[PDB]
Amino acid sequence: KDGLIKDLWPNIRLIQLSGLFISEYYDDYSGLAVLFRKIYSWITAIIIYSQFIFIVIFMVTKSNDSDQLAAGVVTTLFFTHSMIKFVYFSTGTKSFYRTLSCWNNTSPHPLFAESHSRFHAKSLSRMRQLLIIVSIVTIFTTISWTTITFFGESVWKVPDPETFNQTMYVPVPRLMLHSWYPWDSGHGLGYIVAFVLQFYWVFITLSHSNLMELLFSSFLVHACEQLQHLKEILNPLIELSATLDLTSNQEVLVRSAIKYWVERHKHVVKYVSLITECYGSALLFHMLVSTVILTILAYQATKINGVNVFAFSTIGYLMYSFAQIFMFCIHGNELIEESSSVMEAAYGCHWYDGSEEAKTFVQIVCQQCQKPLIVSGAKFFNVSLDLFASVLGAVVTYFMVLVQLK
Amino acid sequence: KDGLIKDLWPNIRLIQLSGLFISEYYDDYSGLAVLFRKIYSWITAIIIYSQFIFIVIFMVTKSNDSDQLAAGVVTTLFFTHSMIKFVYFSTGTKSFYRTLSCWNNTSPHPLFAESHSRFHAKSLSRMRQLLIIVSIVTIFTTISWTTITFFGPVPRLMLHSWYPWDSGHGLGYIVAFVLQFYWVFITLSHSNLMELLFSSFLVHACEQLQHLKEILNPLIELSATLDLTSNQEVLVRSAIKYWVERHKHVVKYVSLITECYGSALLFHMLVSTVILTILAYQATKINGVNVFAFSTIGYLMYSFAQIFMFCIHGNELIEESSSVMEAAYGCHWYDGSEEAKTFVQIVCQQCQKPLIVSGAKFFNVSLDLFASVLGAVVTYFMVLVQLK
Amino acid sequence: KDGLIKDLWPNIRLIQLSGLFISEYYDDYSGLAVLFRKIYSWITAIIIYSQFIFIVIFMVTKSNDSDQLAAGVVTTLFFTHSMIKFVYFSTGTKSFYRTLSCWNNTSPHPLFAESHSRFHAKSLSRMRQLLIIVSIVTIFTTISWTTITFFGESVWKVPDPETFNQTMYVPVPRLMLHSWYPWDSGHGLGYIVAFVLQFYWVFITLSHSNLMELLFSSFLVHACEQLQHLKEILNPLIELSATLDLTSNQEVLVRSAIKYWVERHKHVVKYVSLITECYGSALLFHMLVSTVILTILAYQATKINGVNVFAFSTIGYLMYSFAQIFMFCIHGNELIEESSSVMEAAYGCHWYDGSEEAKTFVQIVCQQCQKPLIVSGAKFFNVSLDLFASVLGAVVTYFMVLVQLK
Amino acid sequence: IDTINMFLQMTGCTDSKAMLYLTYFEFLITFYYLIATYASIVHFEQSVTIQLFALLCMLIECVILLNITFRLYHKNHIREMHQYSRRLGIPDSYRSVINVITKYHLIASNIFVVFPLVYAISVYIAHVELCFINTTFIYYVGVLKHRLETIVQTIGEAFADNDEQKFKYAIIQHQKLLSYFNTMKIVFSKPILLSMSFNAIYFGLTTSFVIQAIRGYINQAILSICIASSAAAVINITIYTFYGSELMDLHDKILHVLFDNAFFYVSKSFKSSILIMMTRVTIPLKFTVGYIFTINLNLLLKILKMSYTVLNVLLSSET
């Protein structure tokens, strides 16, 4: 494996081991191995979807009060991100393969090979750091979710069958997720099995929902690093065309270098277009779910008081929901900035004392690289920090409106 | 008939057979056939206006409650889209004629004949698919409007209208039934056909520009100086000039589209805003699944679909028209001569201006506008729920 | 008196005869005539400001209910538009003279003289249409104001000195506007002089505002017509440089025509900049007053019941404010779009079938006329239909929120 | 240069050695007040009017602490930018406006000092840096505008002799101006964000304190702070927005002066440079900070609209 596949090998191995519906990038293409892997992935999908169905079942059949309904809907919509992303990667592997195959046989020019290698190393460092951060965040979230179960009283509000409008607090098994099960989960082997299943489900769903965003961020990071390398080599590229005391060798070298620069920029543009094609509906669905998530979370935070399990739950849900958006918003904004600054980088070189070919190349670069490359989310909105700022402002405004009207 | 007329032949046929005022595209021009066509169109218009004034008078003389007044206004505003569209197509027919005749005598270059034919076939396939979708949706909602009235002393008519004669018992009941069926069918068909024509207009330009982008790549490969002569330079000059004419034709066609369907889009959006706001108010009083809830959901779904159907195509045109400079960069301009380089620079400068369809300069028709409408409606609905 | 001064002669004469502080464009420069003009203008200003101060003091000293306070504030803010515009043109005639003197010695090329004459006639027709519409609207508004005060019960809510928290409706003299007057305005000679003074004041203030707005609209109309002429002559301009079967006479002719086009476009750009500098602060103040006026009017519209004097007055106030905003918004938008279309018009020419000079001219024209010409009020906003749409949407949503909460 | 020399001396670009440590000495006096105020509500017992006044005091001293090292961070950048600005002065209008600002801030500071020494220590140190950042920005925008005018004059002179060397000099001047503008953005990105957030939070604090004012809880109380600090925030944000929007019209002068008839008499090497710089200057100088904020009168209007909407919502809820 060479190119972007070798660039993103830890990510590919992680998603392969998670249980997602990925088939290529193997080394044991045999009938028994493919049967085992398909069986494992299907079993994982069945388990995840059955647990999700049980969770949504424990939302209408056992929730009476508006607070309980809000909590159930918050949990269901929180895991709907992973539920959507699982099926998206299940039925959309071709787009990911096409994106990963864009940088297949590209080779740096011998003159700028050192700069390309340096920027490749920088991209590797950024990708590894991002993967480490994602893994740490997911592990910490799972650990906190496991811990917070035992810090509260497992009591559920249930109306009294004897009176008319009186309720008690029935004891419930201490479980991470309030879900219904065909078998009893009060104590014993059923309790242990339910706890293990919920722990595995939470960990795996968070793993999928984080791996998808990690892949998107890694793609954007590689595009940004390629654009930065293109900006960096522009000054020596132009200085090659100086008319200092033009030979045929100099002219052909300048033409070849200009051709290589143009081909690399076209590759970057097509790569960003492939990114938009592959990750448009994912971002659209993520934002559509997160809008309702944030609305209900702001309503829940309106009734917050003191420090307790409910306060910690609302704070954690809000923090995770905002971090998930910010993770790709920052990279979209960074790509927009790095694509827009190419014009300034091109104009800031010593192009005045260059050949007519160099001046024409600079003019065409200034013409095209005028509007920034945008990773539009399903051509609905523009993924940048503007979207995150608007979301934060809307959430804060809604919280203020609720705290004023209450 | 050839060109855009032949491309839009089924839609034009539906328009001329649907009672709308069309005077062209007829091959039976006599001194009397025009008279039967005129009297048929006039009778269609008069029965449509009679039914509209009937429902208006029933709403204004039989509504005592706020909810009943809101429902009557909902029906009136739902049908006023087709009401305005009928008069718009009857009066501003010259703009439609000019837009149709914009592509009337264009001749493709000999070199790009296969590409032009393939993209024309793709445009025709998209147009036919859109026509099928619109017809299916119209038929489905027409049958739904009658399958809902049976699930409710008020007669079980799908429209609560006032009539000079009694509509409770006798042949008057069935005659009102069939008249209301025909009126709903005709109004819905007109409202959907106008949007069908606009969407076909918006898709033809996109297909033409995609063809231009595809033919840009060999355009400079022809001019490549790899091991020009007089014949080669003449061919390159002619091909460049043809490409420039094609781009100018596309720009003029988009401008004609914008001039043709700007005020109608503005009126449609103005009515849609009010009906969407009133529907958002109505959706707060939901009492589970029933006839009222089904009606509200259907009205909301149709109102959103009508705007989205052209919003998505406008956004597609806006997003795609800016890729011509990407194609110009794609073709190896560095292999071209000075004339090719100057042409590429001028084309890039021109293409740094996305083709945008404007609703009478008030707003840009795109998915951005669709999202703005969705956000405003959802915010109003949420605010109403919170206040209630 | 040739050029834009002759173009705007009726408006200039109306401004001169309307009491506004002007000093130029006169044919009676004598030591006595200028003195009499100064006294007339000073008397007009004194009367106007005395009436405005009377309205303000009555609103301050005789407002008890919130409804009465809102009505008084609406009237005072409605007439502060004319106050601000009068005091703005009084102390800012130099910028208006500079703008009016821009097209002083301009002359058209012999090749494009017919197009210049046609577009000059079109501009004259548009300006006369605008002046007629302005005069009709002002006269109709004054007539409606005079008629409405006769169609209701002239009673003012006053508190009861006999009881604690009771009130009655005391008779109040039937005046055009509610105001305080040192003399006895109850009935008779005082009543008639008060009524005639109110009529004159309302008419003259509406004229003062409308003349300035019409002047701005005429400036924008002339700029748009000049840009239209420049767009139109592009076809012969580029056809003149065609190499189809160059002589020295033809070369010098096309060079002279190109120079004329460049000078004309520079003149238009400088004229638009002069308009922006001259009439920006007035637009900013107008918007600052109008947003508050529209907020209070949206609040007052929720109290409309049936059809009566209050409903008609509120509808009239809202219609006048929206018309005042739309009058300059439409022309700003027209100028923006009609300056942005110059690049399209230039590209649509037969620029390929021409000399390298024609190609370079087309390239530079397309490069320059890419940023649309924008008239901005003190850089706070861009005068266009977008501003009017935003104002209308904000007012409508505020009214909807108020009527839903109430 | 009355206060620009002050910039230089407290920043350290000049020979002043003890004055540089005096600047850090100011960072300790405020640090003494900030920690003491933060310990008021923690341990000391006091009424409602104290901690709220202390909160305004600690919020103000938070800005004071978040301005000294906050400005000292970009020492080398400020030094290089001043070195560039040393060649050409600033417009006389900018000189007049900085003189007016520095006269008003000094005079307005003395109003609160003698309004009613133990508490007056932080009163004078607050006002100086309020004028300090409001004068540095105007001075260093004025020098940029003057250099832009010089560039325009050089280009206009170049369109009289078809001088390749003169046009190359003008292009080099434009490149240096662009680099200085990037340096200015780097320097001022952070303080502008601090000022904008300060404006927002004090607008919220004042509007809550103003709606809860007439009830009488604030007799001889925080109202003085909510007036003075709000006025300072308003004036600094207005200055920042106005002089960040003045930079949006700098490139239009070049864009309009490049379109000259002489462009049709040059020797085909001048033309390429003209077209390239026209393409570059088509996009105006945008002052983008925080990846989302464009410092201009449009941003000021957006802030004003947010404040007006908040006030309208609060008034509607109250009544």
Ligand SMILES: CCCCCCCCCCCCCCCCCC(=O)OC[C@H](COP(=O)([O-])OCC[N+](C)(C)C)OC(=O)CCCCCCCCCCCCCCCCC
């Ligand atoms: C950008 C984020 C800013 C936040 C605000 C943005 C505007 C709102 C946009 C999302 C729409 C919100 C829908 C209602 C949720 C909020 C309800 C609320 O406030 O009350 C809490 C309510 C109850 O609170 P309440 O307000 O009824 O108060 C009563 C509380 N007691 C009884 C204790 C006094 O919560 C619930 O009832 C639980 C959730 C209900 C089920 C929600 C299912 C969602 C179905 C999605 C359908 C499609 C939606 C598409 C969304 C995308 C559109 C762009």
Ligand SMILES: CCCCCCCCCCCCCCCCCC(=O)OC[C@H](COP(=O)([O-])OCC[N+](C)(C)C)OC(=O)CCCCCCCCCCCCCCCCC
């Ligand atoms: C250097 C670069 C990298 C660093 C920067 C980026 C780092 C990553 C940032 C985001 C990390 C988020 C990690 C926690 C996510 C947990 C999500 C979750 O599921 O939580 C719900 C879950 C519980 O959900 P539950 O309640 O539904 O589950 C319990 C179920 N029953 C009821 C049956 C028992 O866990 C929590 O409640 C989280 C506990 C820890 C939360 C700590 C938050 C921070 C401390 C308080 C806030 C202080 C600062 C803010 C001040 C106030 C602002 C408003």
Ligand SMILES: CCCCCCCCCCCCCCCCCC(=O)OC[C@H](COP(=O)([O-])OCC[N+](C)(C)C)OC(=O)CCCCCCCCCCCCCCCCC
């Ligand atoms: C590749 C492209 C694929 C997409 C294209 C095809 C799909 C197009 C989708 C839009 C279709 C719009 C037309 C059909 C609707 C008919 C409109 C109409 O007139 O209806 C009123 C009419 C009746 O109007 P009426 O009430 O005036 O008529 C009766 C009048 N009285 C009572 C006086 C006699 O019909 C209906 O009521 C139809 C309702 C059908 C609803 C069926 C589905 C209900 C549940 C939907 C989802 C619920 C919410 C889920 C969450 C939110 C959504 C995700």
Ligand SMILES: CCCCCCCCCCCCCCCCCC(=O)OC[C@H](COP(=O)([O-])OCC[N+](C)(C)C)OC(=O)CCCCCCCCCCCCCCCCC
């Ligand atoms: C409803 C709100 C309250 C009532 C309306 C308040 C608006 C302002 C009313 C005062 C009259 C202003 C104009 C009279 C003098 C005009 C002279 C002039 O040339 O001015 C332009 C000049 C600028 O000159 P210039 O260089 O732009 O050129 C002007 C053009 N010529 C040359 C033709 C004149 O000065 C100003 O900018 C005005 C300075 C005085 C401003 C008056 C003080 C009040 C300011 C507004 C207070 C309220 C603000 C609220 C903000 C939002 C808060 C949440």
Ligand SMILES: CCCCCCCCCCCCCCCCCC(=O)OC[C@H](COP(=O)([O-])OCC[N+](C)(C)C)OC(=O)CCCCCCCCCCCCCCCCC
């Ligand atoms: C090609 C383009 C063609 C032109 C297109 C554009 C056309 C122009 C668009 C703008 C239209 C503006 C219209 C005039 C606006 C006037 C604004 C104004 O100052 O209004 C406030 C004032 C009145 O508001 P007021 O409250 O200030 O006056 C009350 C005065 N006191 C308190 C002393 C009693 O003007 C009006 O009178 C407006 C009323 C509406 C006008 C309707 C016309 C009929 C008038 C007589 C009504 C008689 C019946 C009343 C009683 C019925 C029986 C009980």
Ligand SMILES: CCCCCCCCCCCCCCCCCC(=O)OC[C@H](COP(=O)([O-])OCC[N+](C)(C)C)OC(=O)CCCCCCCCCCCCCCCCC
């Ligand atoms: C809300 C409570 C705020 C309390 C403030 C009291 C002080 C607390 C200390 C932290 C607050 C921020 C201090 C200043 C920033 C310090 C960090 C820094 O320099 O970050 C720079 C960074 C960006 O770095 P940069 O901009 O320096 O870098 C740009 C240079 N390039 C591109 C080359 C990299 O910005 C941020 O981290 C974002 C700041 C978010 C926090 C401030 C938001 C203020 C919003 C106020 C309301 C506005 C309403 C109108 C909005 C209209 C448009 C949406």
